[PDB]
Structures are given as C-alpha cells and as structure tokens.
Amino acid sequence: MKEFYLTVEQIGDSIFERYIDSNGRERTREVEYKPSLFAHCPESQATKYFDIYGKPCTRKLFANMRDASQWIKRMEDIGLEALGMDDFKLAYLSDTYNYEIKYDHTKIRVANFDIEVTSPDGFPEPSQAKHPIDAITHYDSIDDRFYVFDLLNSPYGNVEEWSIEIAAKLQEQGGDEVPSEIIDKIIYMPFDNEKELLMEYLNFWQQKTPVILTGWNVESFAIPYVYNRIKNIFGESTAKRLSPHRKTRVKVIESREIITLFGISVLDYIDLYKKFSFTNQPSYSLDYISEFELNVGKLKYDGPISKLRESNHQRYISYNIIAVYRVLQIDAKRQFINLSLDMGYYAKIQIQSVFSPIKTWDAIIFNSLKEQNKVIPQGRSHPVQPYPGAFVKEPIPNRYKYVMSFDLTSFYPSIIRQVNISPETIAGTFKVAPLHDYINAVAERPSDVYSCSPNGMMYYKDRDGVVPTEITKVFNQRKEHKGYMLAAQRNGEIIKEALHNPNLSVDEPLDVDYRFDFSDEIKEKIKKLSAKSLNEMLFRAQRTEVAGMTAQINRKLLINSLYGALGNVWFRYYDLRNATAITTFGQMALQWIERKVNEYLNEVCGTEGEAFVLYGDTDSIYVSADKIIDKVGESKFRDTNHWVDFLDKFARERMEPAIDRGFREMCEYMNNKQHLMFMDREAIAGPPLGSKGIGGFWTGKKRYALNVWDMEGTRYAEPKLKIMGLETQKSSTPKAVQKALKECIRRMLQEGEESLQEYFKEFEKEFRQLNYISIASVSSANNIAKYDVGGFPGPKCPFHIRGILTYNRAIKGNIDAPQVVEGEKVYVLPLREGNPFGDKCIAWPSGTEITDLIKDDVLHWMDYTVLLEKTFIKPLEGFTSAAKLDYEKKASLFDMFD
C-alpha cells in the first residue's frame, strides 16, 4: 500500500513523524528537516519559482528549521517579504507525501477513553488532580477491545471486583445492561492501588499509543487530569510518557490547563460534536447527548456521583464502560472521526487542525500552489474591519397559504467560481454605481473584458484561480455526498409509506445500498416485508442519511469557511476586496432574481405589479403561490398530493428555466467566467387540501413556519413543519414549551383557528403538572463573576445570571453541591414573590436535576404564571398576531345568548 503519516510534530530542528509504511506497519522517524523559504529576486536571475503574482523568487535552503525562522525575523527587520510555508510541519508533509493520500483507517490507532475520579469536595480540578483516578476505560480501535482499569482500593473506599456477569444482566435482574455486543470485548484489570494502575496504564499506553485520541471532554478533563495526576505522583518525566516523543506542553489560562501531547492528535468528541453536528444543545453532558443521538435511557443511579463508587462500585465501573461505548455509538452514527481523517489527509495537515478551516485551507492552497512550483505569499498583519454581508428581505408579517421556495446551490462558493475570485486573479477595478442600478440592469456594464462583482472588483476570466480551483474540488465531494443523503432521505419516505401496510410474516430486512434510490424490484419487495424488517430498514436508511449529512454539510461548512477566511485577518489570503466582492455579488444576485421571478410570475399568471416573492435571505426566495394555485382553482385537484405534484412540475418545468435565463443574463451583465448561479426549488408548502389550516406564516426576518409537503425532491409521507427562528427552534426555550408551541403551530398551519384555541385552552389548564425541567428555560452562563457583587446581582445583571447568584446563595456551604460552571449552560426558573431564595429567579447546571438540598423548595416556589405568559403566551401572541389568528376566542355580541 501507499505510505501515509499518522502524526507530525516540530521539536526544534527535528520533525517527529509517526507513520504507516508500505507494509502497513507503524513506524516513527526523527527527520532533521531542511526547509526552504523564498525571497523575491531580479527578473534576470533564472528560476523555476514564482509567487502567485508571477514575480520570480530564489529558493533559500536552510540547514535547519530554526535557521529558517531566524531568517524570517531578519527579513522583517530589513523590511522585505519572506515567502513560502512558514509552518514547517506542513512543508514536511507536503514534501514527504507528494500525492493524494489514500489511508487505511484500520491501521490508525483510535483510542476512546474516559476516567472516573471520586471527589467528596466538589468537582476534581484537573490542574490540581488531588483525587485518585479510580477507573479508566480505554477502547482501542485496532484491538477492538475495551481495556478496563479498575481501582479496588482507594482512600475513599475499598470495593470488590466488578462482575462482568452482573454487568451483562438486565437492570431488571439487578444488572447494569452493558450492551451484549461489547461484553466479549471487555478486558478487565483490577488493581490493589492507584500507583500500580497508572504505571500499568502507562505501559499499556506505550504498547498501544493512540494516534487519534478521543472521548467526552477528554481535552478539558481526562487528559489533563491523567497527566497531572501522573505528574504529581511519579514526577514530570514519567508523565511525559503520555507523549510518544516524550514532549508535552502545559498551556495555562487561570487555574486552567490544556496539556498538549506531542505526537498525538487529540479530537475531543465534544469539540467535534459542537463544530460538525449543527445542533445547539441545552446541555452537553454525555448523558444528555447520548439520549438525543441514540435514544437510549438516562443512566439511572440512586445516590450522588460522589458516592456512587462507595455504594455501587459494580454500576460505577459499568457506567464508565458504557460512557466510552456511547461515544463510539455516537461516532458510528455521526462519523466525525471519519470526517476528520478525510479532511485531514485531504489537506495534508495534523488531524486536529480540522478544527481550523484557515489552517486547513492554508495547507490545501499551499499544496496546490507547490504543485505548480509556485510560492505562497507571507502572512501579513491587518486591522479588523467590518464589511457588508447578505441581504435579507423584510417580509410583510402575515399568513401565507401556498408557498414555494428556491435556493441557490452552494451560493458563496459558486459566486467565487463564477466570478473567478482569487488573490492572484484580481484584474483591476471599475467605478461602481449604486447597487440597485445593477439589480435593475440600469448601470453601465462594468467590464467588457474582465469578470466583475458589483463591489468594483474585476478579475481575469482566462486564467484559473487557486481559490476557485480548490474550492471546486471540495464542492464536488460535497455534491456527491449530498446526493447519497437525499437518496437515503427519499428511500426513508418509501419505507415510511410501506409501514402503513406491514405484511404479517417473518422475514429479514433487504440488503440494499441506501445511498442510491431504491430500484423498482426493491420497492416491490419492500411492500411485502413485515414491520420488523421495515422498521429496521427505516433505521438503516436514516443512519445512511445521517452519514451522508455529516459528509455533505461539513464539506459545505469547509468551503463556506474559505469564503469566511477571506474576511479573517489571520488568513494568508485575507482580502476584503474579495470578501466584499462575494457578498455584494450575493446581494445583487438575490435581489436581481427577486425582480426576475416577480416579472415572470406576473407575466405567466396574467397579473401585473403583484409581489410574488414574499421573503428572502442571502440566496433564497419564498414565492407566494396562491395565484398559481388559483389560476387552476382548488377544485381541479384530487387530493393534497395532487397540487403538490402540480407546483413541483410547475417549478421544475416553468420557473427554474426562467430563473436559469435570469441568472444567465446576469452572468453576461457581469461578464463572469462561468454561469454557476443554480437556483432549484426547495420547499413546497401549503395547508392540507380542504382543511382550515393556514399553510404558513412569517412574523418578521428569519422567523417563519411552513407546512412542507416536499423538500428538494423528497415527498414526505406526512407533512413536515419547517419552522425557522421561532421559539420552537431555540435551545433556550423549555422542552415542553417547544413541544406545545410546535403543536400550536402545527394546528394553525394544518387545522385552523378553532383547533389552535382548543389546544391552547387544554395546555393552559394542565401545564402546571409538567415536570419542572421540561418547563425550565436554558441559557449560557457567561461572565458570572462580572455581575457578582457580594453574591448579589450587580448593575445590568442578566436575568439568568441573577438566577445563578440566587443558586450560589442557596447552596452556600455545601461542598457536595453542584457548582455552576462558567461558560456552560443553566436551567432557569422564575420564583413567585416571597420565596425563601430572596430573588425572582433561580438557575442551576443544565442537563441535571437541581440538588436535593433546595429542590423541593424550588418546585414549591416556581412561578408557573410567569413561566406560562413569558415563555408560552408571549411567543404564541407573536405567532398568532402575525398570522391574523386568535388563540383565545374573542368576546362577541353572541355572549348574550345561551
């Protein structure tokens, strides 16, 4: 096989590289890397190297890397540009791997681990590591084994060995329900004291040194705790054994510590999740996320965690094993590790650099330029400046019965490729007219020769740009994976349909590739399968869709981040001229097509001057299709699915070609390199046929709800609500309130005013029986100490921060009580006046039951009235007033009758 690196580090004049060789075996080499940097040279000096602008450069080979850096410093002191890749690790990877890296992930050692630390006096600070590590479960992806390190003897209690027999048993058997599929993969190692455990773990670590190291909060807790515990007990020299190159770096931010283990790529899964999952969670405990991702139950245990080991060591160890497995399960679904490996090996960077799109792109562009013997520019210092972004239309707050949406494919990257925007493709500038002059095709055509953006920039049309070139490569990967996703999604609905008439028989789920649309044979067979087989296929379909979703939405994130990078001062190719060129072109593009779409629809409908586009954000338009429906009349339709097919055919056969023409014209207007403004229909929304549902509504910018029947070619078996911006979508809104508001919205859009009022009346009556967590608000807890004046709210103290202070005062003096962590999220509850807490609200760590110390008092003093009106009624008022509805039956003259 082809060789591929695992990890790379720069230690002084040495490059330390772990890699897999041609025989598939992991090796480690210390290379005295001789890096090259470049300087401009006279035209007469013959060379093969040029900067991106065509200026010749002479290559300076250096004896070592530290000499190359000192030269950069000198070139600064002289006042001359020092060109080339200054991050020598990247240069090394580029040299050593001069080809598209094909990697075998089975050879890459991925370690999932989690430790347990019993602490009687609150949260065990990793920087201190005062308390013994009494459990470590370490899963090795190569061995496919869970290595369990169990401390039987601790100053906090002596316990018996964990029983794998009891662990396997059902919880109803007094067992721990450790998944049967991993029972045989567990390797249990009890220890009679902490020192022997840690030394054995270190030796274990050396034998099976992690390449990818992950888990939940491993970077903020596990790794630094383990490192500091081993450091405190055995000394710094043995603690460094955690690094295959025996070098670590303690980065301090008081005290807080993030330890850097050279030779290991740490991908904390909480960070992978926060960056790649595109969720915003009320809590980020592994418990909460697992329940959300895997629909598994919360890990139930009786007492407090600080006593769990003493009371139920059996379950303590079992839960530790499960916590490791749950991350693996989440990763099996989300596939963020795979994503990081793909992106990482594609860019030729340290795998952990996937968290930095700038670093990611700097390397991609660098490697692409190195291919053509071209020399990258030196990074420069720039002041941060604001610059304009997208256009968002101000919608008329109202209900909207029939709505079709249209969205541009990969907008900003497409703008980049179309205009050919790149640092080295800048041709010059032109005198700009007001933006609306270009929108209305009134302004003079910017250039006859160059490709233009209405911001004033001109670009060469002939030559290829390294930014368009490399953004196009990644975009193609994105388009491919989105295809698999949508197909999985479409296949999902097919199974959902067949699940309406499940055949009474015993069979097995069909072997199919869900990434591709089911064949007619497959669809025929599906209608004959049982519920068990169908539900299993629906599950695999959804799993395939999620896998496709991760691959596509994150490649989309990467290319959109290339745009964003252009507006970031730390990007080597930062340039507001290009960034604004993109956004301004974007603003034009959207509003140009708004006019075009309006003109076409007035034309084909027969109307004149009517506004068909009711809303738009960046690259989308929402078209009021009431008159398209009415020109045929509701009468001529069999069922709801009929007019959905009608609008589907209409958008596809009539509107899209018109849009294609409208954009193709715009492309000539700007004299762009290549027409890439591809705006396809997205949503088809409307009420059920013959129902009293309103279909949809807008309350303002970025706030709307639609009863969608079809989405990008996916015909749902049951209509799906597309709600944007509204409280139902906000993590800050209580779970039960989201659920209730959503049902309110559903009823408005699908059933009508009478149905809404009915549900509202019922909710108002019964809502006081809702669990306190389900009605608690959520908020991030930033700058608590900023507003902490003697335990009391300082000036301008935010509501939720006030709640935290109230909490701190209530639990003052309990070391065992859970502390609110700065930056993390909290549940927030209003308190009725005269409550013994002394304030109008309270707050506690999210994802947890509030401590038993004060729980019963909080429950008794919750302000349900405030909770209802503030959280439920007020947003519902906004929804209904916008939609011209009432959630309560208004008073009439008819109230004088019986």
Add this chain to the structure above:
DNA sequence: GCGGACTGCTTACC
C-alpha cells in the same frame, strides 16, 4: 410609576 430608547446578552439564520 413606567414606556420608549438603548444596551448587553443570547441564540437564532444565512
């Protein structure tokens, strides 16, 4: 006593 303007903070949408 408090509504309106403004600010800080939060979390949405692209």
